[PDB]
């Protein structure tokens, strides 16, 4: 596997890879255009998301938005994200239908080795994130690498989600825990 | 009641209401101008806040700032907010005199039904937030819908405030709890 | 001591001091240029960081970035910060070599008196932050005033660090606590 294929697969890779580096620049060019767009340039924002993402249909994302690659973000139907969300998509971020992200939600797939030498080596890795259908993620929440969230979940504002979340629950806290069953 | 009146009152409403939709666009036009203003355009920033907010006198808000409507934000005298605060003002956000928000404070009045069908219906609601006099809210804190904060409160950085806070206390944690009496 | 010298030393000072006020405007002018720079204006961004910081060699900082003064930020070699980090540098922020900040990391040295009258007086203060070598700070973490972080530390995403962190540990939670020894 190439560095790019390894990255997507959740294997150790080098981000300084030429191809990945070019990909990151392209994403940042699209995001710069998105984030400076005039309030009324709805149509442009829609075109940019279709150019950026791995899959999108209907999506509404309040500026600002940030991501690493774009092409590793796969959205189901009728997606909404409020102001200033971030998706570090080194591995796939798969989001189901009718998702709502509140302001400042961060979703991370990127990680580094815990060992300092390994970390400073230029080697890094990722773990994918999968989110089901009808998920509402409250403001300022953090979704960590390798997490799967089921269907019909509510993530409370400010929650830090470190482990999988099953269907039909509310989770809150840091580390998040189940606080209510639906 | 109209959808707008219901929204402000904390009843279920539809954000796709024509009037609310126009109101949101207007707020975003003002916020776009605010957030791109040159470092030295103090005077313009002052004019924009007087056009945006339900009430303001003396206020200093570091860009960026974000909100939903503007007109549901009511500030007492001598207000300060540091970089990149967010106020989702579907219901009134009432803030007393001499308040200080640190960077990245989020105040939410907006909420959704916990039930997925209800949530996907287009119906949503809010609960007002009221903050007293001489309140200091530390960086990255989250103030949730329906919370009242009393006078002379300190909210520690990163606190997630889920319940009312009485006068003359320090609160911290997620969910926040009292950590010191003044 | 002057208000400026007091500020840097972690003594009570008045931010409305003429010199400090001019310094803040200069920092904001540089940050405005940084944050609007085109995706490809790498060279400009490098020049701006060398003009802004108290010390920098090799540094890569994704826009946006925010700070108070600039000159109180001292970076060791091979520094990286991801999107939208904030450093309130009223006192020195000293960061060692090979540091990595994830998106939205906030580092605060600024603080206010807990007493409301003291706080509203215009008097404020700070406490320095020192971070060692080979530190990785996860996304959305908060580093509070007066904290020292040792070498080879991992700060988990969303951690709120309120006390010193010794060498060779992982810390997480709010308030952060040790969750693993390396």
Swiss-Prot record, chains A, B, C:
Single GO term (MF): maltose O-acetyltransferase activity
UniProt entry keywords in alphabetical sequence: Acyltransferase, Repeat, Transferase
Catalytic activity: D-maltose + acetyl-CoA = 1-O-acetylmaltose + CoA
Active site per the UniProt annotation: 112 (proton donor/acceptor)
Gene3D superfamilies per record: Hexapeptide repeat proteins (2.160.10.10)
UniProt-listed PROSITE patterns: HEXAPEP_TRANSFERASES
Membrane-spanning intervals of the chain: none
Enzyme class: transferase
Entry binding sites for acetyl-CoA: 82, 139, 157, 162-163, 177, 180
GO cellular component, one term: protein-containing complex
Top-level taxon of the source organism: Bacteria
Site (Transition state stabilizer): 82
Recorded effect of pH on activity: Optimum pH is 7.8.
InterPro entries named in the record: Hexapep, Hexapep_transf_CS, Hexapeptide_acetyltransf, Mac_dom, Trimer_LpxA-like_sf
The protein's Enzyme Commission number: 2.3.1.79
PANTHER family named among the record's database cross-references: ACETYLTRANSFERASE C18B11.09C-RELATED, SIALIC ACID SYNTHASE-RELATED
Oligomeric and partner information: Homodimer.
Known function: Catalyzes the CoA-dependent transfer of an acetyl group to maltose and other sugars. Acetylates glucose exclusively at the C6 position and maltose at the C6 position of the non-reducing end glucosyl moiety. Is able to acetylate maltooligosaccharides.
Similarity field: Belongs to the transferase hexapeptide repeat family.
Protein name per the record: Maltose O-acetyltransferase
UniProt source species: Escherichia coli (strain K12)
